[PDB]
Amino acid sequence: SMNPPPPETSNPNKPKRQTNQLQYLLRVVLKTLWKHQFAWPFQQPVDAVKLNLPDYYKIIKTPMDMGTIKKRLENNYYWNAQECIQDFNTMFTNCYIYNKPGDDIVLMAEALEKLFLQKINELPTE
């Protein structure tokens, strides 16, 4: 029932790049998804203690949320856009794995993912 340490958002040894694709992921993709009415359960790591979910962190081995992605974008943690796209896809896939199809949280995740996939389609050229 305990919460694990949050995902890594700072690593001096990890190589970084500030690219136009990563800048678009912060100013366009993250910003749009963040103000959505269904963003609030995805804005911070799942608090298994507060929500009384002792099985969450036994099912989910690669936790991810938009708060962690936001910090990784602000702190220039990524090497490329594909690394950030992988964090968003992991967050959505985590929601589908833990929860049952047709749950309210799955409907919320599916609406955010539809919006994310449309913004990712308009990813500018490197």
Ligand X SMILES: Cc1nn(C2CC2)c2c1[C@@H](c1ccc(Cl)cc1)N(c1cc(C)c(=O)n(C)c1)C2=O
Q: Least distance from C-beta 105 to ligand X, angstroms?
A: 4
Number of neighbours of residue 6 by Cβ within 10 angstroms: 13
Phi-psi region of 102 (alpha: psi -120 to 50; beta: other; left: phi over 0): left
Quick one: 51 or 117, whose CB is closer to ligand X?
A: 51
Q: Least distance from C-beta 109 to ligand X, angstroms?
A: 7
The one segment of 8-16, 19-27, 77-85, 96-104 that binds ligand X by CB under 6 A:
96-104
Of 34, 57, 99, 119, which lies in the binding site for ligand X, with binding defined by CB under 6 A? Answer: 99
Of 11, 97, 104, 118, which lies in the binding site for ligand X, with binding defined by CB under 6 A? Answer: 104
**How far is the C-alpha of 49 from the C-alpha of 105, rounded, in Å?**
18
Site for ligand X in 30-59 (CB under 6 A): 40-42, 46, 51
Q: Least distance from C-beta 31 to ligand X, angstroms?
A: 19
By CB under 6 A, tell whether 105 contacts ligand X: yes
| Single-letter amino acid code for the residue at 30 | L
**How far is the C-alpha of 124 from the C-alpha of 39, rounded, in Å?**
24
Burial (CB count within 10 angstroms: exposed 0-12, middle 13-18, buried 19+), residue 69? buried
Residues of this chain that bind ligand X (CB under 6 A): 40-42, 46, 51, 95, 98-99, 104-105, 108
